[PDB]
């Protein structure tokens, strides 16, 4: 196979600023017909990849003219003249001159924005779920930045560990924030022995931890 190598593999950039993604191939990509089939795709989160530049420098119709590509031999570059918030996602360089077609590793473009503290919400388990013998308490951290956030769960003021899992979304295309959901899983019988359920949030946008809580069980 022809090995495609991208640089950097992660690219933080403030909107309005230019960006450059380098692509190096292990072989030259000029086909016997004279064309160089070196292309660039952008895969936004939860979506299929989308073609930006085909055959080194040709912008695919519909793509904004802020994207452009150049290169020859084994060195190729994708440029974004002024980065917009919607450019977040993973950039791949692809070669299809020789079989098999090969892609680079991907370069995640990250948008740098102002600090935004999360809106915190807590949700008790539903009554329908409690009938089933399990209790899920959900804590939502909504639209914060940067991605660094800590959620601590407390039941009757006792700090929990090993009974919660979380996941965070990819950076938003419009406001460049992240969102986090954390689930505390207890059995119905343990959930019913306690009154106070609380999630405590530490984020750089908060000058002191924010606690959302509810009483019942």
């Amino acid at each position: 196979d022809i090995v495609m190598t991208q640089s950097p593999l992660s690219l933080p950039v403030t909107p309005g600023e230019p960006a450059s993604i380098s692509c190096r191939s292990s072989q030259r990509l000029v086909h016997s017909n004279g064309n160089t089939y070196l292309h660039w795709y952008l895969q936004k989160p939860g979506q299929s990849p989308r073609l930006l530049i085909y055959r080194v420098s040709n912008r695919f119709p519909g793509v904004p003219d802020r994207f452009s590509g150049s290169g020859s031999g084994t060195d190729f570059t994708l440029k974004i003249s002024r980065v917009e918030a919607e450019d977040v996602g993973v950039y791949y360089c692809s070669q299809s001159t020789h079989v098999p077609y090969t892609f680079g590793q991907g370069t995640k473009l990250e948008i740098k924005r102002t600090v935004a503290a999360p809106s915190v919400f807590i949700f008790p388990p539903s009554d329908e779920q409690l009938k089933s013998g399990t209790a899920s308490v959900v804590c939502l951290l909504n639209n914060f930045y940067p991605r660094e956030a800590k959620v601590q769960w407390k039941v009757d003021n006792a700090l929990q560990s090993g009974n919660s899992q979380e996941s965070v979304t990819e950076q938003d295309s419009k406001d460049s924030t992240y969102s986090l959901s954390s689930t505390l899983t207890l059995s119905k019988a343990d959930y019913e022995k306690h009154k106070v359920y609380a999630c405590e949030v530490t984020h750089q946008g908060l000058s002191s931890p924010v606690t959302k809580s509810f009483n019942r069980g």
């Binding site: 895969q43 791949y92 539903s126 779920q129 996941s167």
Partner: protein
């Protein structure tokens, strides 16, 4: 309005075969080449091969030769990709992608339209549909908890696709039981909870589960 609609998600046992289909609309099917590209979770893109639906011409990635078979049925504008002797590291989203070159043009080497993907999990674990619970409510947050399903994925939409703004569907977490769980949330105006109906549409294709959960204030 070119559209490539792929088949639903599946779980297959190690050693077994999977046949992923991809139905094309909005263009003369025989005129464009159909490629298959796969992506393992959190990983990059890997081209598998292609089929020229006009003459049955195929090209393959050596890495899958002996396991991959690409066929097509012009009467139903569908291209298939069958992958055999499934190994655990064949768990990936499988895409069909249309080459841009019409009528034998060389632009087929770059792709313009892609299917939605078909997530295939190679696993000896049994399929299980999810249970769906409400996450009851200037702005209020509400959502759904989609618990205990296998394999991935579940899709979640709000009000049949009419509520998109402020919606956050989170990546699933693998629980210690071996089953997945995920939440979908939406922030809405607080001065709308007693007027606007909020329903989350959860779909788990591997088990044919389609649930419409009404989320109301307690």
């Amino acid at each position: 309005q070119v559209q490539l609609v792929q088949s639903g998600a599946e779980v297959k046992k190690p050693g077994a075969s999977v046949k992923v289909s991809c139905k094309a609309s909005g263009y003369k099917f025989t005129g464009f080449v159909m490629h298959w590209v796969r992506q393992a979770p959190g990983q990059g893109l890997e081209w598998m091969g292609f089929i020229n639906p006009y003459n049955d011409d195929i090209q393959s990635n050596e890495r899958f030769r002996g396991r991959v078979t690409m066929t097509r049925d012009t009467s139903i504008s569908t291209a298939y990709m069958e992958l055999s002797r499934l190994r655990s590291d064949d768990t990936a989203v499988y895409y069909c992608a249309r080459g841009n070159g019409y009528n034998f043009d060389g632009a087929y080497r770059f792709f313009d339209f892609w299917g939605q993907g078909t997530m295939v999990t190679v696993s000896s674990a049994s399929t299980k549909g999810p249970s769906v619970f409400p996450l009851a409510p200037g702005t209020a947050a509400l959502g759904c908890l989609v618990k205990d399903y296998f394999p991935e994925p579940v899709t979640v939409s709000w009000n049949s696709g009419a509520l998109t703004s402020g919606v956050h569907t989170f990546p699933a977490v693998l629980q210690s039981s071996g089953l997945y769980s995920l939440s979908s949330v939406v922030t809405v105006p607080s001065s709308s909870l007693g007027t606007q109906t909020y329903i989350c549409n959860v779909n788990h294709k591997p088990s044919n589960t389609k649930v419409d959960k009404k989320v109301e204030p307690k």
